Amino acid sequence: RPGGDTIFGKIIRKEIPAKIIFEDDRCLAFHDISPQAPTHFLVIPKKHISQISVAEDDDESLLGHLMIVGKKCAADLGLNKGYRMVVNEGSDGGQSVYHVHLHVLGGRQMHWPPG
Amino acid sequence: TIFGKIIRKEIPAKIIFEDDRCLAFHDISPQAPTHFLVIPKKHISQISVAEDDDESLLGHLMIVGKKCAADLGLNKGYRMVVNEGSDGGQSVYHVHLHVLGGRQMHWPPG
Ligand SMILES: Nc1nc(=O)c2ncn([C@@H]3O[C@H](COC(=O)NCCc4c[nH]c5ccccc45)[C@@H](O)[C@H]3O)c2[nH]1
Ligand SMILES: [Cl-]
Ligand SMILES: [Cl-]
Numbered sequence: 001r002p003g004g005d006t007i008f009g010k011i012i013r014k015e016i017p018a019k020i021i022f023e024d025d026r027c028l029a030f031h032d033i034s035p036q037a038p039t040h041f042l043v044i045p046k047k048h049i050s051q052i053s054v055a056e057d058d059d060e061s062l063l064g065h066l067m068i069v070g071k072k073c074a075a076d077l078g079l080n081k082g083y084r085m086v087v088n089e090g091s092d093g094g095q096s097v098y099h100v101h102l103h104v105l106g107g108r109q110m111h112w113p114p115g
Numbered sequence: 116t117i118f119g120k121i122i123r124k125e126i127p128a129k130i131i132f133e134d135d136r137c138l139a140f141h142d143i144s145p146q147a148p149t150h151f152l153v154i155p156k157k158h159i160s161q162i163s164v165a166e167d168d169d170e171s172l173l174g175h176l177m178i179v180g181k182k183c184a185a186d187l188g189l190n191k192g193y194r195m196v197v198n199e200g201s202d203g204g205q206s207v208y209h210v211h212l213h214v215l216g217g218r219q220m221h222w223p224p225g
Contacts, residue, residue, distance in 0.1 A: 036223035052181050052195070064174030067197065071162050074199075082200020085162065086224045089181070090192025094220050103224070110204050113146035114196045114213070115221035 004048040008099035012046050021073050026065050029073045038107025039077055043070045049100040052089050063100075070104045079106035086114065118154055118209040131183050137176055139183050148217030149187050153180045159210045162199045176212045189216040194224065 003009035010016040012028055021029040021041055032040040043066045049055055055063060067085060074083045083106030088095040094115070121128045122138055129141040131151055142150045153176045159165050165173060177195065184193045193216030198205040204225065 052177065053185065053192075055178060055181060057178060060174035060178050061171045062174065063177045064170030064172065067162060067173050068165060068167060068170050071165065071199070075163065079202070080200075082163075082198070082202035082205065084199070084203040084225060085197040087177070087195040088192070088220070089184070089189075089194070089216075092189070092192035092216050092219055093194045094222055094224075095192065105224070106202055109202055110198070111225040112204055113225065114194065114215070115224040 002048075003046055004099065006048075006097055006099045008044050008097055008101065009048060012044070021077070022069060024069075026062055027069055029069055032103070035105075037105035037110070039074075039079055039083070040103065040105045041073065041077075043067075043073070043102040043104065045100055050098045051095060052087055052100055055100065066100075066102045070102050074104055074106060077106075082106060082110075084110045084114065116158075116207050116209045118207050118211065119158065122154070122156055131187070132179060134179070136172060137179055139179055142213070147215040147220070149184075149189060149193075150213065150215050151180075151183060151187070153177075153183070153212040153214065154209060160208045161205060162197050162210050165210065173210075180212050180214045184214055184216060187216075192216060192220075194220040196224065 086103040
């Protein structure tokens with residue numbers, strides 16, 4: 001099954017519902033089910049990559065596409081005061097779904113340090 | 116910006132890696148045992164103004180970032196962060212990727 005069987009691969013294949021912001025041939029943007037900000041969504045590749053630590057050199061454009069889509073969706077969602085983009089890697093980074101995903105959070109003042 | 120001075124080697128920074136299109140160096144106010152930045156040499160002021168033909172460059176920052184993290188021993192994981200604007204807490208208007216690890220990172224991420 002293309003994209004794998006994590007919750008994210010199932011969302012890609014429309015097997016589990018999600019609230020979809022934007023979709024193209026390379027990625028999917030949808031809202032997070034447990035938001036940590038007034039606006040909190042995810043941008044994920046449709047290609048399954050388990051984590052950024054195993055991304056290949058040829059995934060450069062796909063990862064860059066994740067951030068460009070992230071900043072376009074943020075603008076379309078009216079996050080004009082700013083937002084924060086987060087990729088987590090592994091146990092210390094806080095990763096709980098092993099499919100590469102970009103968090104985009106906004107609608108409030110984000111604090112420092114970022115966790 | 117001060118990051119421009121760092122790229123031009125006009126002020127010192129503890130450089131981790133450099134190529135023809137980006138620079139990685141330790142952050143001067145670290146928030147984790149390992150905290151570095153990956154910045155492009157092109158002056159993109161902020162992610163919100165990045166163009167579509169910057170997708171390869173922005174992705175290059177992340178691949179460099181994950182390669183430096185491995186080289187710096189972050190085998191238990193790390194967090195990558197890009198801030199935009201006042202709500203995102205962006206501190207310097209030259210786009211930069213934060214990489215933090217060496218300790219458990221918490222949720223929410225700020
Ligand atoms: N729309 C949607 N549908 C789902 O079924 C679903 N299942 C999980 N998720 C979202 O994926 C995201 C998973 O991304 C992460 O791994 N982020 C870190 C959260 C986290 C889990 N454990 C941690 C430990 C330390 C620090 C952070 C964490 C979460 O925000 C979660 O709400 C979902 N989102
Ligand atoms: Cl600059
Ligand atoms: Cl910043």
